[PDB]
Structure formats: C-alpha cells, structure tokens
Amino acid sequence: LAKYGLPGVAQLRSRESYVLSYDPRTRGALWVLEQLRPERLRGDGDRSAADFREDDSVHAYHRATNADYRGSGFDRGALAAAANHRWSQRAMDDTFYLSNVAPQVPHLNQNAWNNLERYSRSLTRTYQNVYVCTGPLFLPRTEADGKSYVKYQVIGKNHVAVPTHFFKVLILEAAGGQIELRSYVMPNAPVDETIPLERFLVPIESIERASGLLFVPNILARA
Amino acid sequence: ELAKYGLPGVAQLRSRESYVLSYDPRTRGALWVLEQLRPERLRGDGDRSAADFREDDSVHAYHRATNADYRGSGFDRGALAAAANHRWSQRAMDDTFYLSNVAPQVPHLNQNAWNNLERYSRSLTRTYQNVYVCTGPLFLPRTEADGKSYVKYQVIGKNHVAVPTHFFKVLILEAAGGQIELRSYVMPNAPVDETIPLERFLVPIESIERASGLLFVPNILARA
Ligand SMILES: [Mg+2]
Ligand SMILES: [Mg+2]
C-alpha cells in the first residue's frame, strides 16, 4: 500500500529558541513552543535583529516568502517573539524564519499582542519556569443564512493564510511541580490594549476543541 | 526541555484493513486516504453484510465527526475510500464506514459524478498491473469583489465538520515495464454534470500538491 510513500506527515522543526509544527496547507505554523528565560538582561542585552528569511526546509510549494507579506497590509508577526530570546544571537535569529511568522494586523502586533508578550515574560519573576505555546485559530462564524463558515483571507502568490484569531497558552510551573495553564485568545484585529489581559482569558478546552490540539499531553490529569 | 510536557499536536495516521489515512483534527476530516484497488470480482468476493457509518472512537471526541453532525446538514456522508472498492472481505468494507474516512459531499455529486469517477477507477484494474488511489479534500481560495482572495467553507454539526470546496483523486497506475503513471482529478463539491467526460477534470499534479500541502511526485521518483 505505502510502496510509493506517504503524501504528507507531520513537519516538526526544532530551532535554537523554539519548536514548531508546520501546516503546508495554510503555509503557517500550527503551534510554536518555547521557554521564557528570566530576565538577566545584562549578559544578554545587546542583540542585532535579523532580516526575515523564508524557510528553506519547507518545500517551495508550501513556503511563505517576504513577497507574500509585501503590500498585504499585514505585518510579519513572529509567534515565538524575538524579544523572548535575546539570550543568544542564534536564538534571536531563528525567530525571523517566516515559518515562525503569521500575518498579523499591524495594530494587534504593535499594541495588544505586544503587551501580552511582555506580560508573559514578566511571569518569570514569579514562577519556577514559564513555557508558552502560541498559534493561529480559524474560527467559524454564523451568517445570515443560518449556516456557519470559516472564512479567512490568503495573501500573496503562495496563499498564506491570515488567521482570524491567535491563541497563547501559558504553561506556568509553581514550585510544587504544579502546572497552571493560562489561555488567551485575541482576534486578528485592532485590539484596545488598555483592556486588561484577563478579559482575553478563555477556557483551555475552547482552544483545544477549535484548534485540533491537545496541550501538555504528558500531564495525564491536570490540576 | 520543551518536550517535558510533550508536544501539542501529533501526526494522525490510521491504518485500516482497506486504506491508510492521515487525519486533520482541526477540520475534523481526513487530509488524504490511500488505497490499493482490487480487480472487479463480484462472484469471487461474494456476499457482504450491511454496514452503516459509525464515528471513529480512535479520534479524540473534541475532533471526532459524528452521525449527528451530518443529520440535517444536507450533505451526504461521502466515503473517500469507497465501499465498493473493498468487498474482498467484510472487515475491508466495514472500515470504509468510519466517519474519519468520510467527508460532507453534495448528495448529487456523491451519487452521480464522483461515483462515475470511482467506477472508472475500478475499471482500470482490467488493464494495469496495479491501481493505487489517494483521495482527499481541498479548500480552494476565490477572489471576491474587494480584489482579495479568501478561503470560505461551511462547517456542520456541533463539532464543526469542515465541508471541502473540492475533492482530488490521484491514480497511480503500474504497467509491466516498470512503467508508472500519475493521473489527477479535481471536482467541485457541487452538482457536477455527470455527462461531462471525466478527462475534463484532469489537472496537473502540481496544482494539487500546491493547493493541498501534499507531495506525490518526489516519493514516486525516489523509488525508481
Ligand atoms: Mg512580531
Ligand atoms: Mg462518496
């Protein structure tokens, strides 16, 4: 049966600063996983951000390019954020692979998603370890005919999918081995950043039901 | 260190008696379904008892299409690996009625023009040494009035089972010199005129590989 190979299997990529799984249909990451180091800012300022680079490990049929973003009116939103990974130049450089990138409404990337990333880093003062899983959603909506539809834009030659929403799952270890899960969803839209961040909390089941994903699966019974 | 709680998202291969498939939990749908066709031997395969569609308890319930998702939708439960391919054993036919092998199909298409494509596929086992078939959904973008391109598909049921916009069917045909051919078909998920000849839905395989995220040619070239 499988004598002519399998047409598609899971595309994990490990980089210096994150691991991701890649969806070649949407030309985007399914999820991106990272740890946030405490702050320390003093060995590891000082960092010289890179150009964005398409990912040669992805087949060119299925690979976002800088031309796909240029003139789209979306920014290149890095899912594993570059400011999480100033602890190493290679660590920071790897966040500028476009496989780490989704089309993001610039106001979201600039203001309220930025605030979410800075709050996530701040929890390293408070917890034994902080891990973060970031990814896209494509959430359906009801229309006038009573039916539900997924509708998302695609941009560029390569039809790079524009997510309707983004999730960020904070995986927070407090000191007992105890894992706390904090789950945020924002729309791919202008979002007022003075709205407190707890208003974008959603139950983790919601993200898991909609995204296809099952987070922290080694945790057989959650707290 | 990142793996210490394990990874969010796993490859979902299922091997059944009559096909291998890969499963997308986000669309609640197979990415592709891969089968090897038998010669048409109705006498030799003999009688089969009835099967109806049942949900795939091997898929997590968050992501598992059920019969209730289809009831009322106006779509047929369209099997990707077709039941009539696999009368050679009862297990083989029964496994095609897992809803993980099923996509929402416009009932006219399931009954006339996709059925004709399936029957034509089985007829090629009269000629070729082997016929491999890989079937799957597509979700193709369209341009709208604003000049921009969107993907739009319906989801049905409590479980949001995605309705493909199109279907693809790739045939791999062996003849006797070590000859290997690929042939690719796309139809819309729509009432298709069942008197249009099937050759008109031939598309080059690159167009399917580009749109689907899948790769067929490099595997097959590698094995020669
Ligand atoms: Mg960014
Ligand atoms: Mg069918």
Curated annotation (Swiss-Prot), chain A:
Q: What does this protein do?
A: Endonuclease that preferentially catalyzes the cleavage of double-stranded 5-hydroxymethylcytosine (5hmC)-modified DNA. The 5hmC-modified nucleotide does not increase the binding affinity, but instead increases the efficiency of cutting and specifies the site of cleavage for the modified DNAs. Shows significantly higher affinity for four-stranded Holliday junction over duplex and single-stranded DNAs. Promotes conservative recombination when the DNA is 5hmC-modified.
Family statement drawn from the similarity comment of this UniProt entry = Belongs to the DNA/RNA non-specific endonuclease family.
Describe its partners and assembly state.
Homodimer; disulfide-linked. Homodimerization is essential for its activity. Interacts with YWHAG.
- Residues the record marks as active site: 78 (proton acceptor)
Where it sits in the cell: the answer is: Mitochondrion
For molecular function, the Gene Ontology terms on record are: DNA endonuclease activity; magnesium ion binding; nucleic acid binding; protein homodimerization activity
**What is the name listed in the Swiss-Prot or TrEMBL entry for this protein?**
Endonuclease G, mitochondrial
Would I find Nucleotide-binding among this entry's keywords? no
Which residues does the record list as Phosphothreonine (modified residue)?
65
**What modifications does the entry list under PTM / processing?**
GSK3-beta-mediated phosphorylation at Thr-65 is necessary for its interaction with YWHAG and the induction of autophagy.
Enzyme kind, highest EC tier: hydrolase
Asked if the Swiss-Prot or TrEMBL record annotates the protein with the keyword Transmembrane, the reply is no
Entry GO terms, CC: mitochondrion; perikaryon; perinuclear region of cytoplasm
Write down the EC number.
Answer: 3.1.30.-
> Could you tell me the superkingdom of the organism this chain comes from?
Eukaryota
Named cofactor requirement(s): Mg(2+)
Biological processes, Gene Ontology terms: apoptotic DNA fragmentation; cellular response to calcium ion; cellular response to glucose stimulus; cellular response to hypoxia; cellular response to oxidative stress; DNA catabolic process; DNA damage response; in utero embryonic development
Site note Essential for catalytic activity applies to 47
Positions with a binding annotation for Mg(2+) = 109
Q: What is its main location?
A: mitochondrion
Q: Which UniProt keywords apply?
A: Disulfide bond, Endonuclease, Hydrolase, Magnesium, Metal-binding, Mitochondrion, Nuclease, Phosphoprotein, Transit peptide
